Structure formats: C-alpha cells, structure tokens
Amino acid sequence: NVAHGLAWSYYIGYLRLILPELQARIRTYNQHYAVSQRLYILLPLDCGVPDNLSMADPNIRFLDKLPQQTADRAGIKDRVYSNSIYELLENGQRAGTCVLEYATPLQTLFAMSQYSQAGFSREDRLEQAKLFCRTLEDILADAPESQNNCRLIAYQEPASFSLSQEVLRHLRQ
Amino acid sequence: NVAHGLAWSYYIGYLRLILPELQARIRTYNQHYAVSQRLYILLPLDCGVPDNLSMADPNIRFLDKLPQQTADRAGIKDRVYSNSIYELLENGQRAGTCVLEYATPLQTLFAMSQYSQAGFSREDRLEQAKLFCRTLEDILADAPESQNNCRLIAYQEPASFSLSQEVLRHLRQ
C-alpha cells in the first residue's frame, strides 16, 4: 500500500543521493574537528518520531553536524542534506558515536493516519510501518549505494525500554 | 496507488511546513536585497524533472535564493528548506519574478518506473502523475496552510512548447 511508495521515495530521493558521499563527509569531519562509518536509521514501528532525539532518551546526546551536502535538485539551487552526530551514553560513559536519525517517512504514515481525507486508518499504522521497513530492507539489500553504508534499527516499544541500548547493540558490530 | 502516498508526503513533510513561513521569507527578501507572493510548483505530467531549471527553458533564469528556513526534524538538527527565485523572460524583457520549483515526488515516480524491483510499469507514469496532481490539488484546496500561498502548474508537452509562457500565463493573475 502507501508504505511501498514511501520506501522507494526514501531510497530514490535521499538514501541513494547521500550514502555514496557519506564516508567522504565522515572522513572530512574526523580529520578537521572516531564516528562510526554507517548511517544509523531509527524505525519506530509505532511511527512516533520526535523531532528532538535527545528528548527521546537522555543517553542520546547531540554532538555535532557533518559538513553539509549540497546539490541542485528539481529547480532548487543548493538544496542542503544535513546529518547529525550523536553520542550514546551507558551508565555515564560515552559508549558509541554515530550519525543517527529517524526515518522521516514514518511521520507521513503517522500524519496520514490522523487526517480524514487521507483514507488511512489509525489502526493501520503498525502494518504500514512494517511494510515500510521490509520494503526498505529489500531495496537496501541489493542497492549498490549502500547496505555497507547504512543500518536500519527497527523496534516496537513493549505492550520499559532504552533507545540508546537498542542502538548500542547494533553499534557493537 | 503510489501517487496518493507521495502527494500526502509532499504536503505533510514539506508544503505544510514551508507555506506558513513563505510570505515572511519573501517579505524579508524584498526588504533586504517585487517577487510574487506564491510558491509556483511545476508538475510535468511526463515526470521529466531536470535538476537545472535554467536548462529547461533559457527564458527561465535563476536570480537568487530566499533566506533559508531551518527546523529540527526527525533527529536532524537544523534541517534546511531552501527555495529559489527565478526571472521569467519574454522577447528579451523581464516579465515575471517568482519562487519556482519542480514537484520532487515526480522524480520518484520516474525512478520507480525504471527499477524492476519497484513493480511500477513505465507506461503507468502519466496516470500516476495525474493522480499525484489531483490528490495534491484536493489536499491544497482544503488545507489551511495554503492554497493562497501556492499555485500548481501542471502540463504535458505536445505529442513545440514554452515552459516560461506556461508559467507567465499563471503569473498573469
């Protein structure tokens, strides 16, 4: 359904554009201002995507931005792709450093589920989020611009949880 | 089909975020460096979206950028939304000035139609583009963040054409 399109859009209009330049930007950051070499993408299957990650878990702490990537895109001169570096803490220690963000399309699923005109039932959010994750995994498994550049972290909170721990488990390669 | 999701995503993750701040940014540009007060969005129904607009018609000429809009978004500190101002020429005269861009989701439709794994037939591009345009018109007709901030310019090239003239017709209010 809608999730398939959004996963393709996330690949076409973002991942395939930034993943080939990512290691160059991390390299540049390391020798100028170690950050792990992969983009970590958070996929909360409840589609709850806060804008401030440091508010979602106080053991996740904004550190810095990468140097920006710019490109002329669809008539926009110097469209900017920006990514943020986070420190992951564990019992008061810096345990991991990575470029970390939520999958933005999950905000579309959430919003669509709230707007009557979108024809998207509220109870369909989890199934769409799963279909999104599956599609995206399938794309990235075969995409030349990545997999090795990129890690998906999908999770559902229980029906008590630590987002930092979830990320740290993946970081522990 | 896929177009419905993409139109909703274009509204949710972009138009509804930038349209409420647009007039403030145009105002700021006018008293600092008249630009029309609406965002003009190009919707080529063949889904052919060049990255350089000045190459699509030499009577469309990049002038400047608006001041950037930034926001913390989905874990990205200071995500940047940028928009470009174009001059429209007609027989060697500056005929119109506006903030102008292509609808980026149309690049997803185009790309999906080229990738075998996307399950999107090449011959389905026009129908999806039309469904995109229709959905988006329906959304914007009732959205509080706009209509009056925003104009859609949908067109199909013949089966000889001037993109500048198409825009100028709309600009002539």
Residue B124 shares a structural domain with residue B134: yes
3-state secondary structure B68-107: CEEEEECCEEEEEECCEEEEEEECCEEEEEEEEEECCHHH
- Residues from chain A contacting residue B79 (CB–CB below 8 Å): 82
Q: Is B43's Cβ below 8 Å from some Cβ in A?
A: no
Q: Residue A104, Cα to own-chain centre: how many angstroms?
A: 7
Residue A110 shares a structural domain with residue A126: yes
Report which of B69, B92, B75, B60 is spatially closest to residue B23, judged by C-alpha positions.
B69
Residue A25 shares a structural domain with residue A74: no
Report which of B63, B110, B55 is spatially closest to residue B83, judged by C-alpha positions.
B63
Sorted by sequence, the CB contacts under 8 Å of residue B47 that are 6+ apart come out as B106, B107, B109, B110, B113, B125, B126, B128, B129
Residue A105 shares a structural domain with residue A128: yes
What distance in Å separates the CA atoms of residue B62 and residue B10, rounded to the nearest whole number?
Answer: 23
Residue B96 shares a structural domain with residue B173: yes
Query: Do the bridges between strand B60-65 and strand B39-44 make them parallel or antiparallel, or are there none, so unpaired?
Result: unpaired
Give the number of domains in chain A: 2
- Tally of residues, chain B: 173
Sorted by sequence, the CB contacts under 8 Å of residue A112 that are 6+ apart come out as A2, A118, A120, B5, B8, B12
- Cite the annotated binding site of B by residue number: 9, 14, 79-82, 104
Residue A10 shares a structural domain with residue A94: no
Determine, for residues B5 and A8 on separate chains, whether the beta-carbon distance falls below 8 Å: no
Report which of B92, B70, B91 is spatially closest to residue B81, judged by C-alpha positions.
B70
We report the CATH number of the domain holding residue A13 as: 1.20.5.5200
Residue B138 shares a structural domain with residue B102: yes
**Rounded CA Rg of chain B:** 16
What distance in Å separates the CA atoms of residue B153 and residue B41, rounded to the nearest whole number?
Answer: 6
Residue A7 shares a structural domain with residue A28: yes
Residue A28 shares a structural domain with residue A85: no
Determine, for residues A74 and B5 on separate chains, whether the beta-carbon distance falls below 8 Å: no
What distance in Å separates the CA atoms of residue A87 and residue A68, rounded to the nearest whole number?
Answer: 19
What distance in Å separates the CA atoms of residue B101 and residue B84, rounded to the nearest whole number?
Answer: 7
Domain that holds residue A15: 1-35
What distance in Å separates the CA atoms of residue A152 and residue A147, rounded to the nearest whole number?
Answer: 9
- Residues from chain A contacting residue B52 (CB–CB below 8 Å): 72, 75
Instruction: Identify the sign of the CA torsion B164, B135, A73, A4.
Output: negative
| Amino acid occupying residue B46 | D
Residue A27 shares a structural domain with residue A96: no
DSSP A15-84: IHHHHHHHHHHHHHHHTT----SSEEEEEETT----S-HHHH-TTEEEEEEPPPEEEEETTEEEEEE--E
Residue A31 shares a structural domain with residue A94: no
- Residues from chain A contacting residue B73 (CB–CB below 8 Å): 51, 104
Distance from CA of A120 to the nearest CA of B (A): 10
What distance in Å separates the CA atoms of residue B60 and residue A38, rounded to the nearest whole number?
Answer: 40
Residue B155 shares a structural domain with residue B71: yes
Q: What is the resolution of this structure in A?
A: 2.0
